[PDB]
Design a protein around this ligand. Structure first.
Ligand SMILES: [Mg+2]
Ligand SMILES: [Zn+2]
Ligand SMILES: [Zn+2]
Ligand SMILES: [Zn+2]
Ligand SMILES: [Zn+2]
Lengths: 117, 79, 427, 44, 93, 336, 39, 206, 64, 193, 257, 48
């Protein structure tokens, strides 16, 4: 019997920082953001946007064990671009998209619900 | 004297020594090479072996009864 | 379900299941053996595919969401009986709440659940360090001999019967109900010879999904079927799908002649699936279509009784038998594993003496005995006056200390009663 | 405390050191009654 | 072949083919504690006391019995310290 | 009787001296854990909290051990007993106020086990040396011994209610030996057949035959997600084999990244023409058999069990005899 | 305590002297009363 | 058996605890002058402090039988000095060789509104004493010589009666708890005052 | 034992359909007809009803 | 002790929590203000009555324990260690901890600090504190803080605080700033929505 | 180097399903929002059954599982009910949970089906959705079940009791135009509902340089919320996790020092 | 039990417990079987 709380998957602990930028000594302009207590919901979404940016040379997410919640994302970028800048920009760009869909859905339901017909 | 034993350390004398040196460091023994961000007695001592500097001499008793006594520095690190 | 009077029967070790279901594919002759009355498993949307890897070597992946809507939930009843004994001429094992006021040996625990009669009531939640039945024997003040549960019972007691035994004494039966949700490790097995423990469980969202939303509750590995050739599990996978969409129990009598693989398949084709069972799935974590079309379908799964909780054993500084000083067993299954000769010999081969010395001596029986040097016989060694004397040799200056296994000291002491006199000569 | 009878199913309250025989009918198998404490389960 | 020769040389070593099933090598040149390893433990020892046969205590199975580091690998060498080498010690502790 | 007590099987002669019931050990079911290195085991939390190494308190660690004792018993990163200098042991369940305990140099804390330890993992029908090999723990939430698939072949298990035992070396002298003479990384080439005992097994072979085939081409999104799973990468994407029409990398190229250092090996894939070697097209291979690995880059050919598995001359064996032990372990984990 | 630790190197087996046994016994010149205790 | 709760990551971050090594002895008033002159000679050359202070001990009567004891000290003599609040742990003395009393100690300077905060929190004032005497120091070691005075009347410091003609002398070191041999240095210093006054570790019990 | 409140796969509430399924079957509807009429179309939402052994029916025959 | 005012400014529109701070801080930088380090205010709570312990980074060693209307004790950091030691005896509460972390901007003897009371892991709200170190007198330095706030804060400028309370010649205290922070924190914890 | 522009297009609505079609978006943005429709939209459901008398033939933790998976009407009060940790209500308590009570004693001869109708709520708005009725337990003469339970608010990653939707169904590229899946033999595979191919053609021709776009959806609400709100509440929620990470990233980029 | 204690003693004479020489040099070649791999001799088979 080893059944742990299933809310811990997203619940941050007292001694747990959510994002910990660990710069890579081996490669210049490379940073490892290690969001803890997230998963592949936010890992595929963040990596998807970093990739669209042309300046981003490499970008990806590995959830190191399925039974331990963490993501590790690395954004190595051209010299002028900063990995921290690439991370800060995408969260905003996705937020615009999400805000756009939300606004657009509301536009859509009202017509259909009231019956565009 | 006449060392007849092989110059290289044996697979098993690199184990008892790495372990013995380690009980010394953990017990507060002086260290013999720089240790940086390292607090683990085996890592501190596996490092010394890399440099040939551990303070121990190995009595390889021969089958007949005579203790040839090679020293850490002379023995060639096999790893 | 074992028999339908589970509520009054009270046998040791009996496990019911929350939702037993009749199989979608049924042999015609099952009805004869009361199986649509006492089924032993649940039809699972199983999907023979390789996913994250945790499904290799007879391992099934499983849906955390479905084992949460009830799939395979079970209760593990275990009955415990204590009989009042009047064997003593004056010794009576009466039934009472032992109280620190009158019984000398009240042990360290919570004796506050036992009610007045002595029996924990139905409905409580027994835990470690709780005393379920309390009895106070009377010595010629009143040593309390009470009953303690072992470890991890932690099951709300369901019934406490108090009634006369065949011997004519007064006895009680307590059934301590415990719920058992499927976890990582529990054996589950199909009806075609394939048995497999779970390797990870994953939630509905992060699992492969059909294009109408049907996420598989079990993902058995593809590699297991070949070498063993159970090509009947895959036929019942097809027929169950045909039966589910046509709504009828599908018969699979050993020889029906109306079931070649092809005839069952053509029926499945009308409903709209690949004639041969494959369906198009999409990776759950990324969403991208898994290239190869996974074979999915409904197949009966039986949940074997064996569970990890019964198997798990662990030990460390555990209770020791005083007579031979080698580990024994108390609560918690603290009797450890055994280093028998076979595994006492790989260690010599690896050449590892110190592990062997540690596992054999330090771990099981570490003793130091003070031995006289001139004669190898053992030596009185007062600790408080710090004197060490070998009476019979009149030596107080030469008493060495030698570490020996306790198991061996007793061989040395026992041999001496027989008069052989080993000298543990140190020189 | 309050034991429950098996046949006539009367709850015959019995103090300690008493015979566990029920009145009216002689069903000598008697089951203890639910705790008056409260235990709280999570639906989980 | 290494493994093949040793089984086929240890067996044919003292000069007579030796059965090596528990019965074949049951007769052996061993200290009483080693020959107390096989069911005659009570009997061999009583004979041993009368005949005063010291057990040389030099066997892997012999030492493990008395909890002494055995003469196996990791066991055949005693280690001694260096008095001169400790000078380089970068005493820090 | 005394003669009866020291008798035969079960007597102080066998039952109590040669084989005894050792402590600091645990047994449980083994389920698959691919995301573990070949030298990791995942002890269940209860077993890890039910066993303990002993850490001599020292100036360097006195800081952490203060918290472990304060938090002892209550939480998994806690200490249970603090054996003292004269040998007494302040069991911490009953010390009334664990917070106030005073640790000193020379005193040893029984820290509950934790990631990074060494344990000798053994199967019960022990026979070959590969039966008792050492693993580094990595404590995980569920109650199962989590093992990598590659090490199952030497253990000879398959995870179907199989049960394996975990014995914890308990002193720094023994940890050194388990670490240096029997760690799964150092026992890949057995002396019985001079062959690697453990080879890429179940799914990972059916995948390697297909990742490494002539028609496989992975696009940019896939290469980066895949290369983040390599722990030997120098961080540089390679140049895609097909460039201008679109940038599509070839499977062989991204398998030449897992391959360690430089190795030269030439072998035959499981499907091999019985005549191609002699005739024309010998070195252009119409069917892509004839694996050639030159300099550490598969230059041609599909990989089979003989090329990647447990046979003499296997790609795994070339590495052990040239490149090393730890590098070979890393390469196996990355391939999986 | 003070007595030094050391390694058994040879074990010698002999029937023990009737006299040595007498001297080593803590019991005074032979167990006498059969009953373990009365007070 | 059981899932001990998992717990966080911060292990190194935090504070080491402060052990107080204490040796306590008494001097009769007639010989006080000889001891004062003697301590001045052995100790560092600093003019004597001549401190006067009022200390009230607060105990918390919670469900657990042992009441938490926090000692609050106000310096009446030194104006504009903050109240000091200290917690003293159970004796950790073990080795006979140490010949010292070891207790866990936390020292916290507090604002004047300390009495009200403690009473609202629920701590209850129990016993109050006024201590007057001289303080001298050698290295880390601090020697305090003081004459405890009983306080009568519910609240005030105007009138005090002497608890004893004699004065307690306490040698105290607030060590960081790193390494040891702190007790050895203390034993040596205590030995010098031993002919003038026998400073020994006296157990608080009876 | 009792119809499970929600299908194990999707989670549709199927628990509320047993009384009619038994009943619609009673009128004459075929197993195909009842499942479709109540609203279950996915293969999972059907297997709970097509295959449930009512058991509380027969443990209610034991007198309390 | 220099007169201080703290208020919460709503993000407004669809501006994300962080987006609004970024903009407000840039507006402060557009006052000629120069950054003078970073400030962290971490507070923990107890359900005992109710205890609050808060510590501004501006004060390096002090820990403030406030008992609602009851007195505030300004104590050394060893106070937190005493609190942890008592912990088994003490009450703990359930994840009520509240922290505001933001940049410090200095504009000619006025220090302005804008931060996001991030509750636990999720940000919600915004706290602005303007302090005047030269102004030892308080309750009538309100004209100053008000004019400066109308300069940058504009709308949502606070009409004083009650920590000034009754008109008095009483000097402003570090305790008063902590009481303002406690009221602001109670409001974020309960504003909801 | 910036955000795409995504459009939506409801194609059918019903009280229990909304088939939107989404367009001009990344495969990931879709899979991510599909996962938030399943495991992050909040709902209110039972979580503290305390049983006072159960003479039913089932145990008293099968009259828990059963109450828990009942679907209660979250309505708009999930917006105004804080989580137990957020509420700081020291576990459950009014305003941090909704109280549900039941009382059935079967004294008449016929079996008395107990059903969701008998779960009664102190808050009028949250009442079991069926308001036919899930059967909690059939009862015989003389047996009683009385229970007190409180319903805390819930995500779905914690347990499937708080899962708003049943079959969330997704699909892009109905004809395998980008040949993501290589039909072993294209002929026998039945056509997708959203097909545009002519009947004769087996599958459409390879169009290589086209990333995936045109994600279909069919959220089917179990009943706790109306199906549209499950879509909108997912999208708000994803924003919060995204908009929460930025705060921490910033409160951490500055203090890299 | 029969091959209980043959060891490669320090001068390479594989010897049993009594110190008797069972094999003069281990395996007749002195090479331990882990680093040895199969090679084609190349001169025995070819024609004169
Ligand atoms: Mg097996
Ligand atoms: Zn003698
Ligand atoms: Zn009756
Ligand atoms: Zn369904
Ligand atoms: Zn509330």
């Amino acid at each position: 019997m080893n059944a742990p709380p299933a809310f811990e998957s997203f619940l941050l602990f007292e001694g747990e920082k959510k994002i910990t930028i660990n710069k890579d000594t081996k490669v210049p302009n490379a940073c490892l953001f290690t969001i803890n207590k997230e998963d592949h919901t936010l890992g595929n979404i963040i990596k998807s946007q970093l990739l669209k940016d042309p300046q981003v040379l490499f970008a990806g997410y590995k959830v190191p064990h399925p039974l331990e919640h963490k993501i590790i994302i690395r954004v190595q970028t051209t010299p002028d671009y900063s990995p921290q800048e690439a991370f800060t920009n995408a969260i905003t760009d996705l937020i615009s998209e999400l805000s756009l869909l939300e606004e657009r859905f509301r536009v859509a339901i009202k017509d259909k619900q009231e019956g565009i017909e | 004297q006449k060392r007849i034993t092989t110059p290289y350390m044996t697979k098993y004398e690199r184990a008892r020594v790495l372990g013995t040196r380690a009980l010394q460091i953990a017990m507060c023994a002086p260290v013999m090479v720089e240790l940086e961000g390292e607090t683990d007695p085996l890592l501190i001592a596996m490092k010394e072996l890399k440099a040939r500097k551990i303070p121990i001499i190995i009595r390889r008793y021969l089958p007949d009864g005579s203790y040839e006594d090679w020293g850490v520095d002379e023995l060639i690190i096999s790893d | 379900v074992y028999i339908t009077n589970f509520h009054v029967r009270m046998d040791t070790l009996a496990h019911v299941l929350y939702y037993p279901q009749k199989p979608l594919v049924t042999t015609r002759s099952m009805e004869y053996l009361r199986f649509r009355e006492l089924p032993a498993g649940i039809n699972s949307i199983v999907a023979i595919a390789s996913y994250t890897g945790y499904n290799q070597e007879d391992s099934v992946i499983m849906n955390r969401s479905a084992v949460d809507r009830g799939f395979f939930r079970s209760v593990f009843y275990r009955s415990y009986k204590e009989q009042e004994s009047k064997k003593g001429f004056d010794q009576e094992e009466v039934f009472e709440k032992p109280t620190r006021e009158t019984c000398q040996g009240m042990r360290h625990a919570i004796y506050d659940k036992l009610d007045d009669d002595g029996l924990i009531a139905p409905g409580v939640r027994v835990s470690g360090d709780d005393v379920i039945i309390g009895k106070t024997v009377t010595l010629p003040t009143k040593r309390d001999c009470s009953t303690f549960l072992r470890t991890s019972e932690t099951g709300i007691v369901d019934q406490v019967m108090v009634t006369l035994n065949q011997e004519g004494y007064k006895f009680c039966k307590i059934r301590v109900r415990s719920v058992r949700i499927p976890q990582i490790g529990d054996k589950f097995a199909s009806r075609h010879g394939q048995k497999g423990t779970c390797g990870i469980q994953y939630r509905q969202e992060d699992m492969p999904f059909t294009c109408e939303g049907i996420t598989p509750d079990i993902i058995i590995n593809p590699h297991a079927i070949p070498s063993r050739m159970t090509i009947g599990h895959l036929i019942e996978c097809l027929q169950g799908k045909v039966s589910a969409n046509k709504g009828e129990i599908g018969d699979a009598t050993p020889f029906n002649d109306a079931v070649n693989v092809q005839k069952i398949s053509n029926l499945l084709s009308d409903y709209g699936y690949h004639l041969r069972g494959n369906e198009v799935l999409y990776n759950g974590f990324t969403g991208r279509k898994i290239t190869s079309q996974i074979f999915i379908g409904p197949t009966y799964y039986q949940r074997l009784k064996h569970m990890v909780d019964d198997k798990i054993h662990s030990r460390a500084r555990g209770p020791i038998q005083i007579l031979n000083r080698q580990p024994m067993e108390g609560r918690s299954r603290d009797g450890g594993l055994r280093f028998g000769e076979m595994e006492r010999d790989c260690q010599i081969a690896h050449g590892a003496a110190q592990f062997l010395r540690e596992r054999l001596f330090e771990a099981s029986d570490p003793y130091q005995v003070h031995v006289c040097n001139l004669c190898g016989i053992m030596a009185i060694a007062n600790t408080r006056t710090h004197t060490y004397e070998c009476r019979g040799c009149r030596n107080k200056t030469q008493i060495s200390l030698v570490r020996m296994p306790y198991a061996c000291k007793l061989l040395f002491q026992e041999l001496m009663s027989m008069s052989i006199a080993p000298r543990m000569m140190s020189v | 405390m309050i034991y429950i009878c098996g046949e006539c199913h009367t709850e015959n309250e019995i103090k300690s050191r008493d015979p566990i025989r029920c009145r009216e009918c002689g069903y000598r198998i008697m089951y203890k009654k639910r705790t008056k404490r409260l235990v709280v389960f999570d639906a989980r | 072949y290494r493994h093949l020769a040793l089984l086929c040389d240890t067996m044919t070593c003292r000069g007579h083919l030796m059965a090596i099933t528990r019965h074949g090598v049951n007769r052996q040149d061993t200290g009483p504690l080693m020959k107390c390893s096989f069911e005659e433990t009570v009997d061999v020892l009583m004979e041993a006391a009368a005949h005063g046969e010291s057990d040389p205590m030099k066997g892997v199975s012999e030492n493990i019995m008395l909890g002494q580091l055995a003469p196996a690998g990791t066991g055949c060498f005693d280690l001694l310290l260096d008095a001169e080498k400790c000078k380089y010690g970068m005493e820090i502790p | 009787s005394l003669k009866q007590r020291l008798k035969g099987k079960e007597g102080r002669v066998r039952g109590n001296l040669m084989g005894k019931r050792v402590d600091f050990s645990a047994r449980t079911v083994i389920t698959p854990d691919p995301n573990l290195s070949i030298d990791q085991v995942g002890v269940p939390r209860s077993i890890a909290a039910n066993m303990t190494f002993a850490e001599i308190v020292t100036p360097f660690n006195i800081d952490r051990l203060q918290e472990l004792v304060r938090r002892g018993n209550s939480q998994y990163p806690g200490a249970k007993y603090i054996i003292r200098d004269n040998g007494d042991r302040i069991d911490l369940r009953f010390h009334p106020k664990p917070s106030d305990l005073h640790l000193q140099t020379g005193y040893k804390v029984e820290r509950h086990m934790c990631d990074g330890d060494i344990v000798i993992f053994n199967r019960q029908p022990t026979l070959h040396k590969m039966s008792m090999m050492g693993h580094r723990v990595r404590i995980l939430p569920w109650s199962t011994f989590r093992l990598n698939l590659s090490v199952t072949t030497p253990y000879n298990a398959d995870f179907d209610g199989d049960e394996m035992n975990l014995h914890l070396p308990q002193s720094l002298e023994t940890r050194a030996e388990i670490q240096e003479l029997a760690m799964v990384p150092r026992m890949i080439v057995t002396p019985q057949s001079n062959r690697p005992v453990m080879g890429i097994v179940q799914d990972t072979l059916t995948a390697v035959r297909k990742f490494t085939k002539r028609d496989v081409f992975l696009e940019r999104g896939e290469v980066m997600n895949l290369l983040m799973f390599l722990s030997t990468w120098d961080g540089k994407v390679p140049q895609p084999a097909i460039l201008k029409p679109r940038p599509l990398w070839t499977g062989k190229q991204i398998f030449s990244l897992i391959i360690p250092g430089h190795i030269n090996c030439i072998r035959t894939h499981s499907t091999h023409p019985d005549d191609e070697d002699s005739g024309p097209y010998k070195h252009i291979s119409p069917g892509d058999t004839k694996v050639v690995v030159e300099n550490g880059e598969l230059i041609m050919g599909i990989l089979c069990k003989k090329s990647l598995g447990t046979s003499a001359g296997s790609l795994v064996h070339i590495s052990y005899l040239e490149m090393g032990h730890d590098i070979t372990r890393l390469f196996y984990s990355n391939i999986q | 305590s003070a007595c030094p630790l050391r390694t058994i190197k040879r074990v010698q087996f002999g029937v023990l002297s009737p006299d040595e046994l007498k001297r080593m016994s803590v019991t005074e010149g032979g167990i006498k009363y059969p009953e373990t205790t009365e007070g | 058996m059981e899932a001990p709760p998992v717990t966080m990551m911060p292990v190194t971050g935090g504070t080491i605890n402060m052990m107080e090594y204490l040796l306590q002895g008494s001097v009769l008033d007639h010989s006080l002058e000889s001891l004062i002159h003697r301590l001045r000679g052995l100790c560092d050359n600093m003019e004597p402090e001549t401190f006067l202070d009022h200390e009230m001990v607060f105990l918390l009567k919670g469900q657990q039988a042992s009441p938490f004891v926090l000692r609050a000290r106000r310096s009446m003599d030194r104006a504009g000095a903050p109240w000091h609040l200290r917690y003293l742990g159970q004796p950790e003395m073990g080795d006979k060789n140490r010949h010292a009393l070891v207790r866990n100690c936390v020292d916290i300077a507090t604002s004047e509104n300390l009495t009200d905060f403690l009473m609202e929190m629920g701590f209850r004032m129990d016993h109050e004493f006024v201590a007057k005497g001289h303080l001298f120091r050698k290295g880390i070691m601090k020697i305090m010589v003081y004459k405890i005075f009983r306080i009568l009347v519910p609240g005030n410091t105007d009138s005090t009666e002497a608890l004893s003609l004699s004065y307690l002398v306490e040698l105290s070191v607030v060590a960081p708890a790193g390494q040891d041999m702190v007790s050895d240095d203390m034993k040596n210093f205590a030995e010098q005052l031993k002919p003038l006054v026998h400073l020994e570790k006296i157990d608080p019990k009876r | 034992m009792i119809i499970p409140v929600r299908c194990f796969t999707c989670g549709k509430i199927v628990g509320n359909k047993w009384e009619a399924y038994l009943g619609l079957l009673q009128a004459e509807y075929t197993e195909g007809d009842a499942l479709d009429a109540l609203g279950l179309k996915r293969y999972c939402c059907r297997r709970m009803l097509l295959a449930h052994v009512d058991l509380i029916e027969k443990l209610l025959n034991y007198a309390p | 002790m220099g007169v201080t005012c703290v208020s919460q400014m709503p993000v407004a529109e669809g501006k994300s929590v962080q987006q609004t701070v970024e903009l407000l801080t840039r507006k402060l930088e557009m006052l000629g203000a120069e950054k003078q380090g970073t400030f962290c205010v971490d507070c923990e709570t107890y359900h005992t009555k109710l205890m609050y312990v808060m510590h501004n980074s501006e004060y390096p060693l002090s820990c403030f324990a406030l008992f609602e209307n009851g007195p505030c004790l300004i104590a050394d950091t060893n106070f937190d260690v005493l609190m942890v030691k008592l912990k088994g005896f003490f009450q703990s509460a359930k994840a009520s901890k509240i922290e505001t972390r933001g940049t410090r901007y200095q504009y000619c003897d006025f220090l302005v600090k804008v931060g996001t009371v991030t509750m636990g892991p999720s940000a919600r709200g915004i706290s602005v504190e303007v302090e005047y170190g030269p102004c030892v007198v308080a309750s009538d330095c309100w004209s100053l803080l008000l004019e400066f706030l109308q300069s940058f804060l504009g709308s949502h400028t606070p009409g004083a605080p009650a920590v000034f309370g009754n008109r008095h010649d009483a000097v402003y205290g570090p305790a008063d700033t902590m009481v303002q922070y406690m009221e602001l924190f109670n409001k974020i914890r309960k504003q909801q929505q | 180097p910036y955000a795409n522009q995504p459009t939506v297009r409801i194609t059918e609505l019903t009280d229990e399903n909304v088939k939107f079609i989404i367009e001009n978006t990344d495969l990931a943005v879709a899979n991510s929002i599909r996962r938030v429709f399943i495991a992050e939209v909040p709902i209110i459901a039972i979580d503290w059954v305390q049983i006072d008398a159960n003479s039913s033939v089932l145990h008293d933790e099968f009259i828990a599982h059963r109450l828990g998976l009942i679907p209660l009407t979250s309505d708009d009060i999930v917006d105004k009910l804080q989580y137990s940790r957020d509420c700081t209500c020291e576990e459950f308590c009014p305003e941090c949970s909704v109280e549900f009570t039941l009382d059935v004693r079967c004294n008449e001869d016929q079996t008395r089906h107990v059903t969701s109708r008998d779960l009664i709520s102190n808050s009028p708005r949250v009442i079991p959705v069926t308001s036919d009725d899930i059967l909690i337990v059939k009862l015989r003469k003389g047996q009683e079940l009385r229970l007190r339970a409180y319903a805390k608010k819930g995500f779905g990653k914690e347990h499937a009791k708080w899962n708003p939707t049943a079959g969330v169904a997704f699909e892009y590229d109905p004809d395998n135009a980008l040949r993501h899946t290589v039909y072993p033999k294209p002929e026998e595979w039945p056509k997708s509902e959203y097909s545009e191919l002519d009947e004769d053609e087996s599958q459409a021709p390879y169009d290589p340089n086209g990333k995936p776009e045109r994600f279909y959806y069919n959220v089917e609400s179990c009943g706790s919320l109306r199906p549209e709100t499950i879509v909108l509440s997912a999208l708000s929620g994803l924003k919060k996790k995204l908009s929460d990470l930025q705060t921490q990233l910033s409160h951490e980029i500055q203090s890299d020092v | 039990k029969s091959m209980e204690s043959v060891m490669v003693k320090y001068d390479a004479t594989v010897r049993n417990s009594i110190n008797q020489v069972v094999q003069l040099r281990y395996g007749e070649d002195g090479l331990a079987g882990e680093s040895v791999e199969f090679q084609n001799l190349a001169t025995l088979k070819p024609s004169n």
